[PDB]
């Protein structure tokens, strides 16, 4: 499939309101209509949202959906503990033979402490590992809440495509949340560009380190 | 009125063929693009593929290579086979009815989800590395060891044979598309220590019988 783009986390207190965005392309949003679900562990997705507004019977009308050209948003008003799931945008993409594409996905909290951003450290290959013919670089994130992030990769300033492993964020001993992420490169990769950088994104903060071969 | 039902078996054999089956009723075999999407735990939705009852198939080019459906509309079923499974495929694997054209008025229709989980009794032993420590003032150090590509779960790690608690911070493990693991341990330290305490990171891998004393050192 192809990125239909969302927040890592949206959060509020009890009764208030909370919005989702969904960025997408001329492919995708730009041909095509929107679908939202809700995600819980465990069980297939809910259907939440169909054809940019529409509810499916069973669905509460605090659920609204709206659309622009290549952009749609998800609002979720008077928010509830029972709406705390994750929630994902998706939508057909008329690239190859046609894709269904589903967002990154957005986790909904109800905020029980306050907010904390978190903290990058980034570790560059080790010569060792070069030695055996390998290159990993290992980006730490530590002491956020809510417990949701997302982790993106450049190769000097651009995006990189492959290689990437993320793990799940996990409760710490004091209910913060930690995460890893992982790119995986060939020592030519690492020692050809300039710098790699780990950028990290939560809530109303980015945070991104960044490591060279020199 | 329109119910699917996935079916197959919950608990697999690594390497083999994962293969499901969706039950349509309620609904014509020609009414939808019959599709499989898999949350594997922690990780976002996938789609992976989807199948028209003619035969018409689009399949994720991620998975393209080990990957093939089918549907029988004698049966009003349609399946999947995934080929040369890790424990990367364990996942919540889903069947739906979606409306390619939304000529549907009720949009797509949704099964219930499984939980497959791919087995293997095979094992293999970490790769440890250095992470070590730059060259860090003013105050504290961060180094560490990384521990890559191993199997099964679990791994532990020590830091000097257990004397060094404090400051140790070691971070959940990250599964791979290979369907192997690898985790870091970090511990911080005092930046006046480096020239003289000695850091050992010791990696225990019972499943593989393994065990590797790595030690930290500037640079």
């Known amino acids: 499939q192809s990125v239909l783009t969302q927040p890592p986390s949206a959060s509020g207190t009890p009764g208030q309101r909370v919005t989702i965005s969904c960025s997408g392309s001329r492919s995708n949003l730009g041909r095509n209509t929107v679908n939202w679900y809700q995600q819980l562990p465990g069980v297939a997705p809910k259907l939440l949202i169909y054809?940019?507004?529409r509810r499916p019977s069973g669905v509460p009308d605090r659920f609204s959906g709206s659309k622009s050209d290549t952009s749609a948003s998800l609002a979720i008003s008077g928010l509830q503990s029972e709406d705390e799931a994750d929630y994902f945008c998706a939508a057909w993409d008329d690239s190859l033979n046609g894709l269904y594409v589903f967002g990154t996905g957005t986790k909904v909290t109800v905020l029980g402490q306050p907010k904390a951003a978190p903290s990058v450290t980034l570790f560059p290959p080790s010569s060792e590992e070069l030695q055996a013919n390998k290159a990993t670089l290992v980006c730490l994130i530590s002491d956020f809440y809510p417990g949701a992030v997302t982790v993106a990769w450049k190769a000097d300033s651009s995006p990189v495509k492959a290689g990437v492993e993320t793990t799940t964020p996990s409760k710490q001993s004091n209910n913060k949340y930690a995460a890893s992420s992982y790119l995986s490169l060939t020592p030519e990769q690492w020692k050809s560009h300039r710098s790699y950088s780990c950028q990290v994104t939560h809530e109303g903060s980015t945070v991104e380190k960044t490591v060279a071969p020199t | 009125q329109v119910q699917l039902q996935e079916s197959g078996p919950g608990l697999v054999k690594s390497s083999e063929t994962l293969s499901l089956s969706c039950t349509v009723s309620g609904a014509s075999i020609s009414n939808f693009y019959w599709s499989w999407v898999r949350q594997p735990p922690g990780k976002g939705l996938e789609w992976m593929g989807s199948?028209?009852?003619?035969?018409?198939?689009t399949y994720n080019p991620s998975l393209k290579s080990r990957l093939t459906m089918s549907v029988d509309t004698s049966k009003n079923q349609f399946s999947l086979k995934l080929n040369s499974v890790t424990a990367a495929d364990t996942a919540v694997y889903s069947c739906?009815?979606?409306?390619?054209?939304?000529?549907?008025?009720?949009?797509?229709?949704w099964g219930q989800g499984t939980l497959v989980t791919v087995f293997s009794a095979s094992t293999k032993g970490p790769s440890v590395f250095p992470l070590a420590p730059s060259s860090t003032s003013g105050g504290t150090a961060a180094l560490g060891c990384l521990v890559k590509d191993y199997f099964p779960e679990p791994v532990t790690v020590s830091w000097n044979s257990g004397a060094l608690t404090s400051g140790v911070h070691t971070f959940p493990a990250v599964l791979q598309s290979s369907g192997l693991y690898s985790l870091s341990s970090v511990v911080t330290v005092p930046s006046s220590s480096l020239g003289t305490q000695t850091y050992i990171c010791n990696v225990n891998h019972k499943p593989s019988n393994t065990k590797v004393d790595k030690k930290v050192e500037p640079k």
């Open positions: 054809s940019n507004n």
């Open positions: 739906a009815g979606l409306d390619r054209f939304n000529w549907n008025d009720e949009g797509d229709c």
């Open positions: 199948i028209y009852y003619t035969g018409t198939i």
